[PDB]
Amino acid sequence: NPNTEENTIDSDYLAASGTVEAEKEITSIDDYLGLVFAIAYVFGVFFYVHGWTSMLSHAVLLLSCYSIIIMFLFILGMPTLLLYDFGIFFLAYLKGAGKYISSVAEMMFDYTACLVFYIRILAQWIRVVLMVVTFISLSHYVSDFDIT
Amino acid sequence: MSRKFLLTFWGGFFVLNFGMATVDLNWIMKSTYIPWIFWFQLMYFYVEGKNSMFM
Amino acid sequence: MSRKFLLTFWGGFFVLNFGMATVDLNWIMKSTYIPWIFWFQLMYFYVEGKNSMFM
Amino acid sequence: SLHEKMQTDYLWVKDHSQADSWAKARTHGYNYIAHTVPNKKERYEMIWRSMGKSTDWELEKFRLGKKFPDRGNKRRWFKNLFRLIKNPMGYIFWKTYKARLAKPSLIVTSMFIGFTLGFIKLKAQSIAYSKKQYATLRAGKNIEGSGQVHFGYHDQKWGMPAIPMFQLMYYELPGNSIVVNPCRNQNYRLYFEMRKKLGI
Amino acid sequence: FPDRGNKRRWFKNLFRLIKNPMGYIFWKTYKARLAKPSLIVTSMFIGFTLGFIKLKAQSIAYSKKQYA
Amino acid sequence: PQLWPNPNKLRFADLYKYQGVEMKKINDSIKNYKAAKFYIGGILGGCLVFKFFIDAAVDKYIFGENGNGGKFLEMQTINSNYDYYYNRQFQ
Amino acid sequence: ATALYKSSALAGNLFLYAYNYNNFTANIRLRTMRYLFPVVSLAIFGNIYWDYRSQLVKVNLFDEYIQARAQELV
Amino acid sequence: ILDYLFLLDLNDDLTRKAVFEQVIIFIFIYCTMNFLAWSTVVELIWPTHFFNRRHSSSQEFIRFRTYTEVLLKISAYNDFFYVLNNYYYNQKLILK
Amino acid sequence: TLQWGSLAERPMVDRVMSTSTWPVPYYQRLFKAYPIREKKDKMSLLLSDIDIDDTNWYQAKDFLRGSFRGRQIVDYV
Amino acid sequence: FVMYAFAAKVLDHLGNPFPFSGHGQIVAAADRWNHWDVRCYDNVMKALKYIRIPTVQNNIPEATRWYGRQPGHLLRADTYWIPNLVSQRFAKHQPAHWDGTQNMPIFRLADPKHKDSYMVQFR
Amino acid sequence: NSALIGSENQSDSMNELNTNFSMTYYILTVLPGKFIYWIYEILHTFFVVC
Amino acid sequence: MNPIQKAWLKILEPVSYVINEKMAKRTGIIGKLGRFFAIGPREYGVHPINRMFIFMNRKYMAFQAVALHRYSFVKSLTHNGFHMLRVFRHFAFVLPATVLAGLGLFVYWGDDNKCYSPDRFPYLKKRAGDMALPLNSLNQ
Amino acid sequence: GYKIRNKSIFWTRAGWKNNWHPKNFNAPRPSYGEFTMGIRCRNDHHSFLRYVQTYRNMSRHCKQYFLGDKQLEETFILGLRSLFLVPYDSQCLTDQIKHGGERRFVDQLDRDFELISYNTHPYQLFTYTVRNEHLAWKNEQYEKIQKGEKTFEQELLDYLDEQVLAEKAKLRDGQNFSIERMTEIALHVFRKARAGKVRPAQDVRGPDGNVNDFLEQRRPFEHPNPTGVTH
Numbered sequence A: 001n002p003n004t005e006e007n008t009i010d011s012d013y014l015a016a017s018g019t020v021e022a023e024k025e026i027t028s029i030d031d032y033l034g035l036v037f038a039i040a041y042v043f044g045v046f047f048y049v050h051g052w053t054s055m056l057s058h059a060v061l062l063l064s065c066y067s068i069i070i071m072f073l074f075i076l077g078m079p080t081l082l083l084y085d086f087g088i089f090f091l092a093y094l095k096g097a098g099k100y101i102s103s104v105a106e107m108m109f110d111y112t113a114c115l116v117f118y119i120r121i122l123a124q125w126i127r128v129v130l131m132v133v134t135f136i137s138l139s140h141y142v143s144d145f146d147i148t
Numbered sequence B, C: 001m002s003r004k005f006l007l008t009f010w011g012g013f014f015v016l017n018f019g020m021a022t023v024d025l026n027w028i029m030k031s032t033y034i035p036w037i038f039w040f041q042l043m044y045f046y047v048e049g050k051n052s053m054f055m
Numbered sequence D: 001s002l003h004e005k006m007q008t009d010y011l012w013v014k015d016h017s018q019a020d021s022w023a024k025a026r027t028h029g030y031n032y033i034a035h036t037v038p039n040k041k042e043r044y045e046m047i048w049r050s051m052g053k054s055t056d057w058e059l060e061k062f063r064l065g066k067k068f069p070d071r072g073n074k075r076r077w078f079k080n081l082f083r084l085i086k087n088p089m090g091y092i093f094w095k096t097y098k099a100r101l102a103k104p105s106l107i108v109t110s111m112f113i114g115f116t117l118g119f120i121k122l123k124a125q126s127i128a129y130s131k132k133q134y135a136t137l138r139a140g141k142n143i144e145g146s147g148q149v150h151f152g153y154h155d156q157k158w159g160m161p162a163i164p165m166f167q168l169m170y171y172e173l174p175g176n177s178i179v180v181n182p183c184r185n186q187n188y189r190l191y192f193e194m195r196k197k198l199g200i
Numbered sequence E: 001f002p003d004r005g006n007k008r009r010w011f012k013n014l015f016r017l018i019k020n021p022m023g024y025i026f027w028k029t030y031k032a033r034l035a036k037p038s039l040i041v042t043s044m045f046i047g048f049t050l051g052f053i054k055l056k057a058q059s060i061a062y063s064k065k066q067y068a
Numbered sequence F: 001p002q003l004w005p006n007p008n009k010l011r012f013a014d015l016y017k018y019q020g021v022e023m024k025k026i027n028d029s030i031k032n033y034k035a036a037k038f039y040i041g042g043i044l045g046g047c048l049v050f051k052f053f054i055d056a057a058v059d060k061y062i063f064g065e066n067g068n069g070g071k072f073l074e075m076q077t078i079n080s081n082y083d084y085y086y087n088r089q090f091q
Numbered sequence G: 001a002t003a004l005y006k007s008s009a010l011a012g013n014l015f016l017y018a019y020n021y022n023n024f025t026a027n028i029r030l031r032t033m034r035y036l037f038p039v040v041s042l043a044i045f046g047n048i049y050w051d052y053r054s055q056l057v058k059v060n061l062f063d064e065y066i067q068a069r070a071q072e073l074v
Numbered sequence H: 001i002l003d004y005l006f007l008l009d010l011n012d013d014l015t016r017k018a019v020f021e022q023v024i025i026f027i028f029i030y031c032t033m034n035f036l037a038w039s040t041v042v043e044l045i046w047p048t049h050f051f052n053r054r055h056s057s058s059q060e061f062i063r064f065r066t067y068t069e070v071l072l073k074i075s076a077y078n079d080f081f082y083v084l085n086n087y088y089y090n091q092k093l094i095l096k
Numbered sequence I: 001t002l003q004w005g006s007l008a009e010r011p012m013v014d015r016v017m018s019t020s021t022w023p024v025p026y027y028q029r030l031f032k033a034y035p036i037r038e039k040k041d042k043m044s045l046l047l048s049d050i051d052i053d054d055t056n057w058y059q060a061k062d063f064l065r066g067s068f069r070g071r072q073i074v075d076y077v
Numbered sequence J: 001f002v003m004y005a006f007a008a009k010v011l012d013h014l015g016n017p018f019p020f021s022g023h024g025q026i027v028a029a030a031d032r033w034n035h036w037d038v039r040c041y042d043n044v045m046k047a048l049k050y051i052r053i054p055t056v057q058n059n060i061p062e063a064t065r066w067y068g069r070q071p072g073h074l075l076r077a078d079t080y081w082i083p084n085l086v087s088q089r090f091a092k093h094q095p096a097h098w099d100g101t102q103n104m105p106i107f108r109l110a111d112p113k114h115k116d117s118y119m120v121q122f123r
Numbered sequence K: 001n002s003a004l005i006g007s008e009n010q011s012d013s014m015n016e017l018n019t020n021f022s023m024t025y026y027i028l029t030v031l032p033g034k035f036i037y038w039i040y041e042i043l044h045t046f047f048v049v050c
Numbered sequence L: 001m002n003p004i005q006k007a008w009l010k011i012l013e014p015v016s017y018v019i020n021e022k023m024a025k026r027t028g029i030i031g032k033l034g035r036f037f038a039i040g041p042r043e044y045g046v047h048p049i050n051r052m053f054i055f056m057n058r059k060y061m062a063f064q065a066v067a068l069h070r071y072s073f074v075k076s077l078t079h080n081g082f083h084m085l086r087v088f089r090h091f092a093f094v095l096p097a098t099v100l101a102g103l104g105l106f107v108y109w110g111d112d113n114k115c116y117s118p119d120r121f122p123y124l125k126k127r128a129g130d131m132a133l134p135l136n137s138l139n140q
Numbered sequence M: 001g002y003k004i005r006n007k008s009i010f011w012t013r014a015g016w017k018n019n020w021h022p023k024n025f026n027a028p029r030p031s032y033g034e035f036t037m038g039i040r041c042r043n044d045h046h047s048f049l050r051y052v053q054t055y056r057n058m059s060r061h062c063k064q065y066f067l068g069d070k071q072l073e074e075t076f077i078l079g080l081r082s083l084f085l086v087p088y089d090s091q092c093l094t095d096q097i098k099h100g101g102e103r104r105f106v107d108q109l110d111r112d113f114e115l116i117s118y119n120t121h122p123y124q125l126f127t128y129t130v131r132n133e134h135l136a137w138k139n140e141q142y143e144k145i146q147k148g149e150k151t152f153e154q155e156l157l158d159y160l161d162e163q164v165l166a167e168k169a170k171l172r173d174g175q176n177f178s179i180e181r182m183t184e185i186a187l188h189v190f191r192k193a194r195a196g197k198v199r200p201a202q203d204v205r206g207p208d209g210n211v212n213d214f215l216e217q218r219r220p221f222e223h224p225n226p227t228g229v230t231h
């Protein structure tokens, strides 16, 4: 009975709430839905979602340590494939029309546009460092709290 | 309800079984203190505190 | 029912407290095995067996 | 239907006892009583009613007559054990259906699993340490007491706290990573040289 | 909004237990104690509980023997 | 209607030829086991052919080109020169 | 015992394919399994037989050396 | 015969990397994790489909017949339905 | 109420009997048993509130063609 | 009842019905090929054969302790520590040319105080 | 220890060869007989003390 | 009912005649004993393990169909079929590769099945009677 | 019975019951030629003909397995149209869909034809099963008619025609034999006839509140041990 069993209720409405966000028009939900599952074991450590994997290896956080690398590589490739999709005009999609007749001058302005294209991405991983540093600071205080 | 006295026996039989079998049980209790405090204080709001506090 | 999570914490806290305090808990378990078997096998009929056996 | 009777008997068990075939021995409900339900007193009243209808409300007959236990509940603990052994997941599933209608959050479910497995992991380490003490015993060192919670002047090691902080810094020793040195394979050079000397 | 009426409910019950533990325990267990088990069961509870406390005391004493 | 089998009032010969829904499932599974004879047989045939290439590769891996030893005798490491001399001093 | 288990586990995969033959063969959503299942099986067989074959060769090289070297010392 | 078949070796893999024995552990876990996630997503479309196809109709709109409802009406009718139609026809269209 | 009793006697409060028989079996049935996946002679319940459409006249001809008077009606129409 | 009788036949060999609890007991014939592939290891002989008598100075023999400190070889490959999971992807596996010994520490050492094994818990 | 779950008492007959000279099918022949005598000791006791 | 049960019947055909016809109805105890060990269709003879496989096989197979049924990464490169902008096309063959790797789940289960165990320390403990040894036993 | 009480059930950020253009931040915006250098878009004007060719393929490729059954081809045609008329008759404003509903539906139908080309579409297998169950029942009637025997369906038609005469032979005060009366006469015959059949229990509860399953065998216990096969 999907209307009395809270286990299928929670999972059904949760999935519907996740797939309905395809209207946000990020990209094919059929493609990136698998990465969400991996990213969930990175940030789900805060909620102990990795508990059922404690006997599957000698490292309880194995799946979380791999997912953070997966999360980094495929997020690092999302901008690269986007430029491949733009084609040879990819620099016009970023910066627009040039200003000077010198191609060497624009070459330098176009490089900055391509770096910024990636810095908007790579710079957001400093946020993840703050979450870990703050998470460690709490584990240090609780693990060293007074007990006698 | 019809076998409370009987189930209570076998319930304690296995507790004694585990306790008589587990000789380093004190080492397990002490090893469990830190995670018991850490996880309960971290997940309290998202489970119980939310029903009387910020959100 | 409003504090099942909180009371669950303090319950296991005092269990760990007693377990962390009791270093020879294994000696207590083994010293309890005999009285557990004796009193349950002796009083089973007068408590539970009477309802299905003999009287 | 056609295969209904043959199949239904194949899926489930029936009660073979004929305890209720005997009339006078039938229980009125005074053998296994519910004590805490809100209809407690309504149950006792129906027991009293059944005891009166059986004696035309002359309960002196019941006092002089023989009182019997509930023969239908005989060997019930054994019967549940055999069903648990036959299909433990089905016995557990249906015995916990009403309890599993109320499903706690993902956080609570993850804590049950994590703490339960973490407890089993430490129990597995305690077993391995017991084998270390047996080898130590056989090697010529008698052991007073037990465990690794050294009461005296020794260093203890409590076990990896099951929190991410320590699970990122530490990991348990995998025995499969302790290997024979590959230099062992260099002794095969003797064989290749002998085969050529003997003309093979 | 949450149920701000349930705020600080654990602290309040703790102070009532400290003020009068026997009254707090009596009324919180009244409906449960309406169904009283047999003399045998009640005795087994007390006997096993007091026996467990007696062994706990001996283990405390054996620790003082190990410290000496 | 009333001739339907009953597990209690059943004959020995009838139980031997019951052929109920349980067997009907099995007969469907058997239809797949038979139809997979060529697919499974092709795999085993390749294992038998691949077996002979492995025999020559093992000898190539152990004995090498001229019977003096192959890559089986090679062992590589990621340790630096400092790590190696640290382990020696550790010994 | 290791070579027999891995052979029985590989046989279990062939049963899983046979037990599910109609789905793997006719359903196009499982084409990738139909196409690459035998490639993975051959590589698995190769690992099994490679290890067994190498073990067998080393055992014979060892047996023939102890016998030859024993006579030289006599 | 080529050296490419050397990749099938696990007896002496500790001489080159000793990495295969550890990476497949993650791969087995990653498959198990996805099996639980994807199986839940694809399976749990039935409650919505079962509900909408039985409660989403309204009297201020026309409910149009689907493919399945066409085949069931024309090629899966029972005996009573066949009888009821001809019973109505013979009485009203023929016998008035 | 929220105070129904002990945990062991919780499955007792569920049964509601339609007759005056004592003692009463406690177990309250959750679902209907469905051991054999039988094809139901029953017609599908999707054919419930579907407005008039093309399938109505196509089936009428099939049923009318089963009679001599119906074959005349269809051909003329 | 039948399965209860069959389980009795097995438990005469298996002993304990619960898993992860104990081991079975099988008496086997004594032949020259017992432990034939481990005759080269010395510690296996001492553990199987010798039951040493503890002395008043209750300690493991010094010789046994000294041999036990000679560190064993532990593989560098490690995916359980995330720093090595990243670093070892950029590591270059170079050939370790045999120097004529059987103890070349081309990997890390199984000692708690080794600079490449201090993260491992030895208990 | 053959009735304990995950026993750590490795020195109490766990790592020793322990045979006997009793009837085999222990749990079907010997162990029930110990319980049969148990039921006699307690039934004879109840009837006496009562 | 299955073929293995029918095989038992032909072997136990005379035994069934002795229990069900003679003993099961003679009188007294011989009746209770013959009616208890009667021979016929198995009551509760279902095998949950068989069913457990059938359920998990079907559930895991439905996952294989989803993970293996993906749009190609190669076809999306030309921007001419069904895919112009696919910024996560390089994730198309991750789940398929993950399912094909699942075929080695049981072939490579445990440490002994991933390497030559006699060159590993846990093998020494098994041959020593599951007994703890010093970590350097493989060298001495 | 029960009606949804929430008046805002069909409200969305885009409007009432809007399932064609949900509100999202990255909304469509126009493009200007004079300022646009290059563009990457997949939209085109080929959906109309793809909608036509898709219908012809799905029809012609499914008829391969109908074996010339004319009645099945016509029934299948009516079902195929119901699948293509969805955008023409739906409440959803298919003309106002976010990025072109025409391209969306065409691509969705193409995925169906892909399965049809392999003869693996559930509607195909559903059609074969439904038809075989129908022909088996029509052949059972044909074999009974060739033998001069009367079909179960004719026995009711004849038994119902006489029951109507008995009712209208006594209905002389009035003379309006409504369709309602004719209906409840047949149902009284169907219930009686259906109950006569040995059918599996369909309703959860029988005349009593108790369930009609094989599991609803409670106390008192009166069944002995099960008996074995007879020789």
Ligand SMILES: CCCCCCCCCCCCCCCCCC(=O)OC[C@H](COP(=O)([O-])OCC(O)COP(=O)([O-])OC[C@@H](COC(=O)CCCCCCCCCCCCCCCCC)OC(=O)CCCCCCCCCCCCCCCCC)OC(=O)CCCCCCCCCCCCCCCCC
Pocket (backbone or CB within 6 Å): A080, A083, A084, A086, A087, A088, A089, A090, A114, A118
């Ligand atoms: C350690 C390294 C780390 C670096 C990692 C980087 C990895 C990057 C991976 C990305 C993928 C790369 C693969 C490229 C696939 C290309 C396939 C292809 O060929 O399709 C063509 C395709 C173009 O097709 P289109 O755009 O769809 O349409 C074309 C129009 O129709 C055309 O319209 P048109 O006809 O009007 O145009 C005219 C013409 C105009 O062309 C011109 O401009 C002319 C130029 C002058 C020519 C010389 C003239 C000489 C005149 C002589 C005169 C002689 C006079 C003689 C007189 C005679 C006297 C008698 O234009 C063209 O036709 C040429 C366009 C194609 C050029 C492709 C250039 C590719 C160079 C890549 C080289 C390196 C590849 C390494 C790969 C390694 C992989 C292992 O090429 C592309 O789309 C290029 C896109 C690539 C973008 C990638 C950007 C990724 C980011 C890279 C840098 C990131 C740095 C930050 C790092 C951060 C850490 C992560």
Ligand SMILES: CCCCCCCCCCCCCCCCCC(=O)OC[C@H](COP(=O)([O-])OCC(O)COP(=O)([O-])OC[C@@H](COC(=O)CCCCCCCCCCCCCCCCC)OC(=O)CCCCCCCCCCCCCCCCC)OC(=O)CCCCCCCCCCCCCCCCC
Pocket (backbone or CB within 6 Å): C055, D064, D065, D066, D067, D068, K043, K046, K047, K048, K050
């Ligand atoms: C005159 C007193 C005789 C006392 C004898 C000594 C003690 C009993 C020995 C026999 C053991 C069986 C006991 C059955 C009677 C149960 C009586 C009972 O427990 O009281 C229930 C009774 C109220 O509970 P109830 O449920 O209404 O009673 C009805 C029955 O439950 C059920 O209601 P019912 O109507 O269905 O049953 C009526 C009752 C009628 O009983 C009589 O009429 C008595 C017949 C004359 C006496 C025969 C026994 C004489 C023993 C002397 C020889 C002893 C040799 C020992 C060694 C040497 C001794 C020097 O029982 C019988 O019908 C007996 C028939 C036996 C059937 C045999 C079938 C074959 C079975 C073969 C296997 C046997 C294995 C048994 C296992 C071992 C047994 C533990 O309490 C009272 O009567 C209060 C007043 C005191 C009564 C007088 C004292 C009699 C002993 C009771 C213990 C007093 C404790 C006082 C402190 C109270 C707590 C602070």
Ligand SMILES: CCCCCCCCCCCCCCCCCC(=O)OC[C@H](COP(=O)([O-])OCC(O)COP(=O)([O-])OC[C@@H](COC(=O)CCCCCCCCCCCCCCCCC)OC(=O)CCCCCCCCCCCCCCCCC)OC(=O)CCCCCCCCCCCCCCCCC
Pocket (backbone or CB within 6 Å): A007, A010, A011, A014, A015, A017, A018, A019, A021, A022, A024, A026, A036, A037, A039, A040, A041, A042, A043, A044, A045, A046, A047, A049, A052, A064, A065, A068, A131, A132, A135, B046, D104, D105, D106, D107, D109, D110, D164, H033, H034, H036, H037, H040, H041
């Ligand atoms: C375009 C949009 C993006 C697209 C999104 C698409 C999403 C698709 C959804 C598809 C859903 C899949 C359907 C099947 C689900 C069934 C499995 C399940 O877990 O359901 C639980 C199900 C539903 O749970 P619920 O009770 O309804 O609560 C759900 C919500 O919490 C609601 O209840 P609440 O409101 O009370 O919760 C409040 C929330 C409040 O949370 C907050 O307010 C902020 C949270 C911030 C977290 C901070 C993270 C810090 C991390 C620090 C890391 C430090 C260490 C890192 C070390 C790394 C190495 C260096 O706090 C929570 O409790 C969160 C729940 C825990 C979530 C854990 C994962 C979090 C990461 C999410 C990744 C996706 C991000 C998308 C981006 C969204 C951006 C807006 O409940 C059950 O217990 C039944 C199943 C239980 C199975 C347990 C086994 C779990 C593991 C196996 C599961 C199967 C495979 C893995 C699936 C992935 C699971 C994580």
Ligand SMILES: CCCCCCCCCCCCCCCCCC(=O)OC[C@H](COP(=O)([O-])OCC(O)COP(=O)([O-])OC[C@@H](COC(=O)CCCCCCCCCCCCCCCCC)OC(=O)CCCCCCCCCCCCCCCCC)OC(=O)CCCCCCCCCCCCCCCCC
Pocket (backbone or CB within 6 Å): B041, B042, B044, B045, B049, B052, B053, C006, E006, E007, E008, E009, E010, E011, E012
């Ligand atoms: C530049 C240098 C700076 C230096 C200074 C740095 C310091 C930074 C200060 C900034 C931090 C504070 C930020 C302001 C917070 C404002 C938030 C707010 O609006 O109030 C929320 C919060 C909400 O409470 P509520 O809404 O009224 O009702 C609570 C619920 O009903 C729940 O009550 P219930 O009855 O239902 O029972 C459940 C309750 C109680 O449940 C329990 O059972 C826990 C009991 C814990 C205490 C007992 C521990 C056991 C050991 C002792 C045994 C005692 C009992 C023994 C009995 C006798 C035995 C025979 O659970 C709680 O823990 C409630 C805590 C309040 C919620 C906060 C989230 C807590 C989650 C984490 C839990 C783990 C931490 C526990 C901390 C202790 C909390 C009391 O109210 C506050 O508590 C505000 C606290 C802020 C006080 C600030 C005072 C001035 C601070 C500066 C003074 C100088 C400090 C110098 C330090 C020097 C360095 C060390």
Ligand SMILES: CCCCCCCCCCCCCCCCCC(=O)OC[C@H](COP(=O)([O-])OCC(O)COP(=O)([O-])OC[C@@H](COC(=O)CCCCCCCCCCCCCCCCC)OC(=O)CCCCCCCCCCCCCCCCC)OC(=O)CCCCCCCCCCCCCCCCC
Pocket (backbone or CB within 6 Å): C046, E036, E037, E038, E039, E040, E042, E043, K049, K050
């Ligand atoms: C003239 C004729 C005789 C008249 C005598 C006068 C009688 C005056 C009565 C005065 C009443 C006093 C009222 C105030 C006390 C009420 C409070 C109370 O606790 O009652 C229990 C009361 C009622 O319990 P119940 O569930 O209604 O059951 C009532 C009966 O037990 C019934 O339960 P049942 O229906 O299930 O029947 C089954 C029965 C079945 O019993 C049997 O069938 C046979 C019993 C055979 C016993 C064999 C003994 C073998 C001994 C072997 C030991 C050898 C070692 C020796 C060591 C030597 C060293 C060399 O088994 C039992 O019931 C066990 C009950 C334990 C009784 C212990 C005393 C036994 C002998 C007493 C002899 C008194 C002379 C009577 C002479 C009559 C002769 C015909 O329990 C409560 O709920 C109140 C709270 C109790 C908390 C537990 C701690 C209480 C302890 C302190 C109590 C106050 C101070 C001490 C008072 C004396 C206590 C024993």
Ligand SMILES: COC1=C(OC)C(=O)C(C/C=C(\C)CC/C=C(\C)CC/C=C(\C)CC/C=C(\C)CC/C=C(\C)CC/C=C(/C)CC/C=C(\C)CCC=C(C)C)=C(C)C1=O
Pocket (backbone or CB within 6 Å): G013, G016, G017, G020, L004, L049, L053, L056, L057, L058, L060, L061, L102, L103, L105
């Ligand atoms: C191929 O794609 C895939 C699937 O298909 C879709 C899957 O379903 C799945 C899921 C897989 C599963 C659900 C199966 C999981 C199975 C697991 C975990 C192990 C099962 C273990 C058991 C059932 C216990 C078996 C115990 C034993 C074998 C020990 C005792 C020995 C026994 C019983 C057999 C005796 C041994 C022999 C060598 C003799 C063999 C005897 C025969 C062949 C006789 C056969 C007789 C008949 C009548 C057929 C995967 C992973 C997959 O990759």
